[PDB]
Amino acid sequence: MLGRTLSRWVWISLYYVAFYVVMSGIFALCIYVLMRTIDPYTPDYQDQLKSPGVTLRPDVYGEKGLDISYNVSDSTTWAGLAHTLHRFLAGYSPAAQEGSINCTSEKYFFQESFLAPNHTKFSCKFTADMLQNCSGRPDPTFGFAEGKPCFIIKMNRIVKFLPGNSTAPRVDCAFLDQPRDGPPLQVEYFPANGTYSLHYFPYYGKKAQPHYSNPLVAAKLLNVPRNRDVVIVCKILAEHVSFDNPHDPYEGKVEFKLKIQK
Amino acid sequence: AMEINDHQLSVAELEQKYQTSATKGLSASLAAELLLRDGPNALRPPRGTPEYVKFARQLAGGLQCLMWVAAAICLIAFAIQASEGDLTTDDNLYLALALIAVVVVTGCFGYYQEFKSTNIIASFKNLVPQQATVIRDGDKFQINADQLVVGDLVEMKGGDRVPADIRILQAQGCKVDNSSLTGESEPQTRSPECTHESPLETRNIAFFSTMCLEGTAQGLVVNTGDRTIIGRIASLASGVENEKTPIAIEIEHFVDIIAGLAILFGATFFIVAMCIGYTFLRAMVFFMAIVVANVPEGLLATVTVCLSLTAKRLASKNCVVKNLEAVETLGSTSVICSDKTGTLTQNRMTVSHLWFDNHIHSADTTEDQSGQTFDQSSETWRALCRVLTLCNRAAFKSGQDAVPVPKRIVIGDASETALLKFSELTLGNAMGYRERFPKVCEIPFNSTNKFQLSIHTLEDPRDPRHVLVMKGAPERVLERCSSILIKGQELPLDEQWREAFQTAYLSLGGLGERVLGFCQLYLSEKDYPPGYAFDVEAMNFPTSGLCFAGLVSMIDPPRATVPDAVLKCRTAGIRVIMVTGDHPITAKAIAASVGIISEGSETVEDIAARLRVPVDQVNRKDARACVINGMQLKDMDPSELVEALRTHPEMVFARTSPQQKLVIVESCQRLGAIVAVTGDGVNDSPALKKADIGVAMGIAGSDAAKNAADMILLDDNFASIVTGVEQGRLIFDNLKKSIAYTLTSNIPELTPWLIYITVSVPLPLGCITILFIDLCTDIFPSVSLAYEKAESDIMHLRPRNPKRDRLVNEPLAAYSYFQIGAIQSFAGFTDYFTAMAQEGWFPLLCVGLRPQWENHHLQDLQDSYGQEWTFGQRLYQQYTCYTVFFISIVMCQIADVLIRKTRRLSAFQQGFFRNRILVIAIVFQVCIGCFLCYCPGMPNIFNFMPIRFQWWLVPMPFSLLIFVYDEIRKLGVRCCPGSWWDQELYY
Ligand SMILES: CCCCCCCC/C=C\CCCCCCCC(=O)OC[C@H](COP(=O)(O)OCC[N+](C)(C)C)OC(=O)CCCCCCC/C=C/CCCCCCCC
Ligand SMILES: CCCCCCCC/C=C\CCCCCCCC(=O)OC[C@H](COP(=O)(O)OCC[N+](C)(C)C)OC(=O)CCCCCCC/C=C\CCCCCCCC
Ligand SMILES: CC(C)CCC[C@@H](C)[C@H]1CC[C@H]2[C@@H]3CC=C4C[C@@H](O)CC[C@]4(C)[C@H]3CC[C@]12C
Ligand SMILES: *[C@@H]1O[C@H](CO)[C@@H](O)[C@H](O)[C@H]1NC(C)=O
Ligand SMILES: *[C@@H]1O[C@H](CO)[C@@H](O)[C@H](O)[C@H]1NC(C)=O
Ligand SMILES: *[C@@H]1O[C@H](CO)[C@@H](O)[C@H](O)[C@H]1NC(C)=O
Ligand SMILES: *[C@@H]1O[C@H](CO)[C@@H](O)[C@H](O)[C@H]1NC(C)=O
Ligand SMILES: *[C@@H]1O[C@H](CO)[C@@H](O)[C@H](O)[C@H]1NC(C)=O
Ligand code: ALF
Ligand SMILES: [K+]
Ligand SMILES: [K+]
Ligand SMILES: [K+]
Ligand SMILES: [Mg+2]
C-alpha cells in the first residue's frame, strides 16, 4: 500500500507487463526479419577484414606478446610446446582430412556450383606430411630438442578473399632488429618457399565448405644464437595482404620474442 | 537587547539613571570609559561567508558525490591495472579526467546559480550621520557621531540626520522624517512632553538616522549602535536565517530520486556480478558504468541555462533579478504580503476629490494622466480653481518644462505641492495665473489664525477690486463664512447647507483623506482703492462673512497599473495582503481602491455600523475583510494571529512595525505558503529578507530594500509581478519537460551494460560515448524546450501545492525510464544486432561471446561464417557497435524531444515548428552525429566508426513508435479526464 492501494498495483503491473510483452514481440519480429534477410553463405560486408590476420603455433603469450622461451638441455622446458604442436597437427592428420579432396590445380579454386554432398563445395586436402620435416615425424620434438625449433604459421581465413595470383603467397621470417655482427636469420620452409598454394583460395565459408582446413607453412629456424633474447617477425608476402596497420599487430604479420637457452 | 522606556522618565530620573546633566552633559573621562565599554555608535556589519567556501559546497551533492566516487573507481582501476604493467586502459584515466571536469563545471554552474553580488550590509552607512554636536562639561563642541555614548547631551538642528536615539529635552519647532521606521515621509513634530506609552509613537524620542527637517532640538542619548531601533532593523535584515528556495528544494528532491535509483542499480548488479563470477575490480568497473549511466551529467547545467534564459526574458521588461533561483519563486507563490506607501501608491499627495455644486467630483490621480477626468464646465468650478491657484506659495524648479507635471519637483508643503500640481494640470500655467493676479497682502498659516489668507488685485485693469481668498479646515472656515458659491451664484447659508457640508466633510474624512476648505471674498473699490496698501497686522479686512467656494481632499493615490495587477494576482489564486505602517483609515481606503478588499466585503465594524449592533455580537465569519492595527496585533498571540488569518481572506495590517511585518510573513510561511513581499523602504527590509522572494521598487526604493530584495522593478511597474507569475509557472512546466527529456536517455545507456554483464555479449556501448550523449547531443535539445509556449491558461490556474506538486514525481520518472527509455533501448539493440550480423556475427553467436571476444591471446576467433578475426579487428567491430548504439539513441532522442514539447496537448495541434530553437537543435543533433561518425581520425580519437547508412535508418521505426504511442497516450488523457488512464499515465 506504498503510494497506492493493492488493486491499483495490480493494474499498473498488468499495464507494464503488456507494454514490455508488446515491445519484446516487436524486437523478436525485427530479429526474425533480419535473419530472414541475412545470406547464409556470404557475409554482407567485410569492413574489418580487409587484410587477414596471421597466427603462429605454438602460441605462448608473455607480456602483451608472443614470448617463447625454452632451455634445450631440460626436456620439460619444451614438453608443452611439443605437446601443443602435436595436438594442433592431429587435426591435419589424414584421418581428419578425409572430408577434403586432393587438388593439383596450383591456381585459384573458383567454384560456382555445389557439387559436394548435400549442396556444398569442395575443399582441398592439407595433410601433416606436407610439412615434411616439421610434421612431427620422424622427429617428435619438432627440432626444439636440437635448438632449431619448427614454427607453424597460419593465415586467418576470410570468405571470398584472394591474396593475389601473380605467385603463391609466401612467408618471409626475419629478425625484427638485425644485430650488426649477427647474420640474417636463415629459416628453412616447408612447403618449398613457405608458400600457400593458390588452390586453397578462395574460402567459401563454414557452410559451403564444412571440412576446409587452412594451409600451413612450417618455418624451421637454424640461425638462433643460444642464450640471447631475439625478436623474429614473420610476414606474408602476398599482393592483397598488407602489414602496415599499427593498431593491429597481427594483420598480415606475426612477431614473437624467442630465447633459446643452453 | 533593551527596550526604550526612558521617554516616560522625568529629567531627574534620567539624570540618576545615566549620571548625566540635563544641561552640562557627560564628563569627558566618563564618556571615554563608556565608549570603551559599549563600543562606538556605529552598526556592526556581519562578516557573512567566504566566496570559496560557498563554492566548495557546490562541488558536493548527490550527483556530485556519485561522480567523485565514479572517478575514484576509475583512478583505482587504472592504477592497479598499470601497476601490473598493462597500459591499454588509458581510457580509464581519460574517463576520470572528464568526470572531474564535469563535476567542476557543474560546481561553477551551481555557484553562478545562487550567487548574489550585493553586499547588503553596506547599505546602513549612508543613513548614518558623520558629525554630532555634543555638550560635555557645559561646552557645545563638534565630534564624529561614532563617539556618542548613552547619556550624552546632543544638540541637533534641521537638515542634520539624528545621530542616535535621543531623549529630547528641549525643542523649538523640531520636525523629523521617520520614514526608516514607518515608511511615511510625513513630518512628525518633536516635543518634550510624552504623548504615547509605546516609545515608537511618542513625540519626545528622536531616532538614529532620521533626517531632522527643520527647527532645533536638544536631547540625551539613550541608545547607541545596534541597540537603536535602526540597529535592530539592520540586525534583523542583514542577519537572518538563510532559507532554501522552492526550486532548490525541488532540485534536491529529484537529485535524491536519481541518487536512489543509481545506488540501487549499481549495488544490485554489483551483487549480481559477484555471484555470477566476476572479480572485485571488474564488478567495481561495472558499478562505475552503472552509476555513470544513471547520473545525468548535463542536467544541472541545462537547468542553470534555462534559468538564465528566463532571467533574460524577465529583465527585458526591466525586471532585474539577483540570483537565478528567484526567477521561479513567483510562479509558486500563493501569498503576497505588500507594503502600501511607495509600493501600491506613488507616494505623492494629489487631489482626490472636490466638493462643489452639491456634488463630489473625482479628479484623475494617475501619474501619466491616462484616467477619467472630471467635469470642469461649471462657473462655481472656475471660481474655485482660481481660488486654489491663488492660495499657494509653492513654486517649481525652473527648467523642468520637459519633465511631466506629476513627476516635476516642487518646494513647499505636501498639500501645497498637490494643489500646485493639480492647478498646473487643470490650467496652462499656475505661475502665470498667480503672477497676473498680483499679491498685495500675504498671511501664511498661523497657529492663532488657524488659516491662510491673501489679498489679490484682479487681473483685468477695468476691475480694481481686490479678491480675498482663504484656505483652511472645513469646520474652521464654516464659522468664518456666510455665503457660498452654489451652482455659480452666491447663496446664503441655511441648516440644509450646513448639513450637506458636514456630510461631505465626514465622507471625505472617512476615505482616509486630508480635507482643506476654500473660500473667497471680493472687495469693492469703494472702500479699498487700487492704492490701498493691505497691511497684515492692521486687519482692516473683514476677514469674515466670506463665500465658501468648495471643499477639496487629497490622498496618496495608487499607481495606474496596481488595481489591474492586484485583480490579476487574485485571479491567479494568490492571496494579497497589505502590511503597512500608515494609519488604518488610509490603509483601508487604499485597500478598497486597489482591490485587496473586494466591493461588498466588509469588516466587523462595517457590519456593526450597518446593523447598529455592537462589535461583540457581530459574527466574525460574516466579515470578509479585517483591518488589524499594530496595537491589537502586538498583544495578539500566534494562535489568534493564525485564527484571524484563516477567518478573513482579505487582510490589512496597519500601524505595524518592521518586526510585526516579519512576524506576519513568518506566520504565513508557517502555514505552508510561499510568501512574496513587495516593499521599497528600510522598514520593509527584514520582511524582504524573510520572504521566499522579495521584490523592491527601483526608483522609489531605498538601498536597504534593494539590497535585501531578490528582484527589482527598475521601471516601478507593479504589473511586472503578473509577468513574473506567468514566467515562473511557465518555466516550471518547461523545466519538467526538459528534465523528462534529459532523463529519458539514461536507460538506453544503462541497458547495454546490464545485458553485457548478464548475457556476456560484446560491449554494445562505451563510457566515453555515453558521456558524448550526455554532454553534446543532449544539451541543446533539452535547453530548447525552455522556449515552449504555455498549453493551458496558467494565469487562471491555482498555485501548485509544494507538498503534492513536484518537479520530478514518480509518474514523470516512470514514464521516462521504463517506457520511452525502454523503447530507445530496444532500438539500440536492434541496430546493434543488425550491424553485428551484417558483419558475420549472428545473434546467437554473440550470446556468451564476451570471454572469447575480449581475449588478447585469441587472434583467430571464428564468426558465424567461419571467418577468423584478430583482436584488433574484433575491437574495431566493437567500436562499430558503439557508434550504431549512439546513433540509435540520437534518433530516438529526436523523436523524444518532438514528444516532450507538450504534456497534455497534441503536436499536430500546437505545431511542430512554432519553436525555432527546437528545430535548430534537431538539425544540430543530426549534424554532430554525422561529424562524429565521419570525421577522419575518430576511430582512434573517440572510438567512433564511419557507419553505413542503413544503420542510420534502422531505428527510425522505433522513433516513429515513440511518437505515435506518446500521441495516443495524450489523446486518451484528453478524451477521458476522469479515467484510470489519465490518473496513472499522465505526467
Ligand atoms: C526489465 C525487463 C527487461 C526484459 C527484456 C526482455 C527482452 C526480450 C527480447 C528478446 C528475447 C528473445 C527474442 C529472440 C527472438 C528471435 C526470433 C527468431 O526466431 O530468430 C531466429 C534466430 C535463429 O537464426 P538462425 O541461426 O536460423 O540464422 C541463420 C541464418 N539463416 C537462417 C539464413 C541460415 O534465433 C535467434 O536469433 C536467437 C537469438 C535471439 C537474440 C538474443 C537476444 C538477447 C538480448 C536481449 C536484449 C534485448 C534488449 C533488452 C532491452 C530491455 C529494455 C528495458
Ligand atoms: C538487492 C540484491 C538482489 C540480489 C539478488 C541476486 C539474484 C541473482 C543472483 C544470482 C543468480 C545467478 C547465479 C549465477 C550462477 C553462477 C554463474 C557463473 O558462475 O558463470 C561463470 C561465468 C564465468 O565464466 P567465463 O566463461 O566468463 O570465464 C572466462 C575466463 N576467462 C575470461 C579468463 C577466459 O560468469 C561470467 O563471468 C560471465 C557471466 C555468465 C553467466 C551469467 C549468469 C547471470 C544470468 C542471469 C542472472 C540474472 C540476474 C538479473 C537480476 C536483475 C536485477 C534487476
Ligand atoms: C514476476 C512477477 C511476480 C512480478 C513482475 C513485475 C514486473 C513485470 C516489473 C516489470 C516493470 C516493473 C514496473 C516498472 C514501473 C513501475 C511504475 C512505478 O511507479 C512502480 C513500480 C512499477 C509498477 C514496476 C513494478 C515491477 C514491474 C511491473
Ligand atoms: C638449462 O638446463 C640445464 C639442465 O637442467 C641446466 O644445467 C642449465 O643451467 C640450464 N640453463 C641455464 C642458462 O640455466
Ligand atoms: C551431408 O553430407 C555428408 C557427407 O558429405 C553425409 O555423411 C551426411 O549424411 C549428409 N547429411 C545429410 C543430411 O544429407
Ligand atoms: C630434414 O630431415 C632430413 C632427414 O634426413 C635431415 O637430413 C635434414 O637435416 C633435415 N633438415 C633440417 C633443416 O634439419
Ligand atoms: C590470375 O587470375 C586471373 C583471374 O582472376 C586469370 O585471368 C589469370 O590468368 C591468373 N593468372 C595466372 C598466372 O594464372
Ligand atoms: C622456391 O622453391 C623453388 C623450387 O621449385 C626454387 O627454385 C626457388 O629458388 C625457391 N625460392 C625461394 C625464395 O626459396
Ligand atoms: F511603505 Al510602508 F509600511 F507602506 F513601509
Ligand atoms: K547518463
Ligand atoms: K528573500
Ligand atoms: K541522458
Ligand atoms: Mg515604502
Numbering used by the authors:
A (entry chain B): 29 to 290
B (entry chain A): 47 to 1033
What does the paper say about this structure?
The gastric H+,K+-ATPase mediates electroneutral exchange of 1H+/1K+ per ATP hydrolysed across the membrane. Previous structural analysis of the K+-occluded E2-P transition state of H+,K+-ATPase showed a single bound K+ at cation-binding site II, in marked contrast to the two K+ ions occluded at sites I and II of the closely-related Na+,K+-ATPase which mediates electrogenic 3Na+/2K+ translocation across the membrane. One of the notable differences between HKA and NKA is the presence of Lys791 and its salt bridge partner Glu820 in HKA, which physically restrict K+-binding space at the site I position. In this work, to elucidate the molecular basis of the different K+ stoichiometry in these two pumps, we evaluated a series of NKA-mimetic mutants of HKA with increasing substitutions.
Our step-wise and tailored construction of the mutants finally gave a two-K+ bound H+,K+-ATPase, achieved by five mutations, including amino acids directly coordinating K+ (Lys791Ser, Glu820Asp), indirectly contributing to cation-binding site formation (Tyr340Asn, Glu936Val), and allosterically stabilizing K+-occluded conformation (Tyr799Trp). This quintuple mutant in the K+-occluded E2-P state unambiguously shows two separate densities at the cation-binding site in its 2.6 Å resolution cryo-EM structure. However, this quintuple mutant crystal did not diffract well, and produced only 20 Å reflections. We, therefore, determined its structure by cryo-EM and obtained a 2.6 Å resolution structure in the presence of the transition state phosphate analog AlF and 100 mM KCl. As expected, enhanced hydrophobic interactions between the introduced Tyr799Trp and surrounding residues induced luminal gate closure, and the molecular conformation of the quintuple mutant Lys791Ser/Glu820Asp/Tyr340Asn/Glu936Val/Tyr799Trp adopted the K+-occluded E2-P transition state. Its EM map now unambiguously showed two spherical densities at the cation-binding site, highly likely representing two K+ ions. The positions of these densities are very close to the site I and site II K+s in NKA in the K+-occluded E2-Pi product state. Satisfyingly, in the quintuple mutant structure, Asp824 now makes a hydrogen bond with Lys791Ser (3.0 Å), and fixes the Lys791Ser position suitable for K+-coordination (2.7 Å) as seen in the NKA structure. Total valence 35,36 for K+ calculated from the distance between K+ and surrounding oxygen atoms showed acceptable values for K+ coordination at site I (0.65) and site II (0.68). Except for this water molecule, K+-coordination in the HKA quintuple mutant is almost identical to that in the NKA K+-occlusion state. Interestingly, however, despite having the Tyr799Trp mutation, the quintuple mutant clearly showed a K+-dependent increase in its ATPase activity.
